[PDB]
Design a protein around this ligand. Structure first.
Ligand code: MN
Ligand code: MN
Length: 467
């Protein structure tokens, strides 16, 4: 097609710009937070990188407290917004490359953020640039909005939308294709414990596993104080690993037993296709004679969290043909002698699920075990009529170059789209490709990247040039 050929003509520029942006470790770090770096050095630097190539290419930019900003492209009354985030999730062990040193092979590019969300953003970016290079007659302005905190708390767009212009129409290239006109409600809360003797066979000293609500933990570590004979615990733990097909290991160190479990990290919108390292370790600890609190902590996990991806053990198993299942992820698990423990849960649900009702019932159920709920942000399900001219306008672009007649459907990602009333999430991913978002060895294919660019090219054209 006219568009695919055009794009190929930029294949090398796109790869270079992407590389640059992949090379920036824009993972949030609150220990370096500053007014200059609200969420740390990384995200800040990634934002400015977008300002650079922008400037390089002649586009005007506008920043907002170094937490988010826009790029201006078009000319006219209306403004098509395109919401990209440039922050990224941390990367764990087991990588076959440096997560933040992009590798580029014949077929793909390897690096954290290739798939979500650096790959798309830029693909989006070159759509504008290409048009502009064509000296087109813009009939609408284009605001590429870049956020730096979307993967965590929404500090980026929350601020951006207090003072800045709200686009008249917009999409986020940061879920799936071929359109995503709806998204489950996203939520996060904590299950916190309470304190409460006689020198048990084992005392749990600490437990850490998992860092982000929106990721399945692939690492878990427990520090255990053994009382008398511990060769049993080792042999047992090593059998536990084998039986469950896990990686991990054990070291006694300063007279203390360090139990470690590797798992498989996966996006939190779906934990069932991953292996929660934290939950398994706790499943294992359940077989020991432990101090009362550790025992209560472990029991809780096994009663409510373990092997319960769809909130089943929480009396929250619920489903809809339209927006799907309720999913519950345990992204954060911590415990210590003084304060522990804590379960951080990422629960998502379809329109119709009564969160508060559910959440409030569970809160009373849980009292007796000495636990309590601590709600975090709660953002409601987001729906845009598949048929809205906007959506059909984007889909047409997908269908013309893909010919996949599939209907726009509704995932549970948690994109930027719901920032706009008719906000939608438009692509990135082809049914064609491996969804390694939030996983190790994350990569994007040249094919996808380029074919995405091309579709973004025709769509943004159809939509801002052609009247
Ligand atoms: Mn994303
Ligand atoms: Mn993400």
């Amino acid at each position: 097609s006219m568009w695919k050929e055009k794009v190929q003509q930029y294949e090398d520029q796109i790869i270079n710009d992407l590389k640059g942006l992949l090379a920036i470790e824009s993972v949030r770090d609150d220990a370096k937070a500053s007014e200059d770096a609200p969420v740390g050095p990384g995200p800040r630097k990634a934002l400015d990188y977008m300002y650079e190539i922008a400037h390089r290419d002649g586009f005007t930019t506008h920043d907002v407290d170094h937490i988010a900003g826009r790029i201006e492209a078009g000319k006219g009354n209306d403004v098509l917004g395109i919401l990209c985030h440039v922050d990224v999730v941390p990367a764990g062990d087991g990588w076959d490359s440096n997560p933040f040193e992009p590798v580029v092979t014949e077929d793909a590019i390897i690096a954290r953020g290739t798939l979500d969300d650096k790959g798309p953003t830029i693909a989006a970016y070159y759509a504008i640039k290409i048009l502009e290079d064509m000296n087109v007659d813009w009939k609408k302005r284009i605001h590429m909005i870049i956020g730096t905190d979307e993967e965590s708390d929404w500090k980026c767009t929350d601020r951006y939308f207090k003072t800045e212009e709200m686009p008249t129409l917009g999409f986020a290239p940061d879920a799936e294709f071929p359109c995503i006109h709806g998204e489950k409600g996203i939520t996060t809360f904590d299950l916190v414990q309470n304190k409460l003797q006689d020198e048990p066979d084992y005392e749990l000293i600490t437990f850490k596993s998992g860092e982000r609500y929106n990721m399945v933990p692939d690492h878990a570590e427990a520090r255990v104080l053994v009382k008398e004979n511990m060769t049993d615990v080792i042999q047992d733990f090593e059998y536990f690993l084998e039986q469950n097909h896990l990686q991990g290991d054990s070291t006694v160190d300063s007279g203390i037993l360090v139990l470690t479990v590797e798992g498989k990290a996966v996006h939190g919108m779906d934990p069932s296709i991953g292996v929660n390292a934290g939950l398994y370790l706790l499943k294992f600890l359940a077989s020991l004679n432990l101090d009362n609190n550790a025992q209560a902590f472990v029991a809780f996990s096994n009663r409510y969290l373990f092997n319960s991806d769809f909130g089943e053990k929480m009396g929250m198993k619920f489903h809809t043909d339209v927006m799907g299942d309720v999913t519950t992820n345990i992204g954060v698990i911590t415990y210590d002698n003084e304060n522990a423990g804590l379960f951080g849960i990422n629960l998502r649900y379809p329109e119709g699920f009564e969160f508060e009702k559910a959440m409030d019932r569970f809160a009373n159920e849980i009292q007796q075990y000495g636990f309590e709920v601590k709600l975090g942000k709660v953002q409601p399900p987001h729906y845009v009529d598949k048929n809205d001219p906007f959506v059909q306008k984007l889909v047409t672009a997908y269908r013309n170059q893909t010919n996949d007649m599939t209907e726009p459907y509704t995932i549970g990602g948690g994109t930027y789209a719901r920032n706009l009333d008719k906000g939608v999430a438009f692509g990135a991913m082809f049914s064609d490709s491996e969804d390694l978002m939030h996983q190790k060895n994350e990569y994007i294919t040249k094919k996808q990247l380029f074919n995405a660019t091309s579709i973004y090219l025709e769509a943004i054209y159809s939509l801002c040039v052609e009247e």
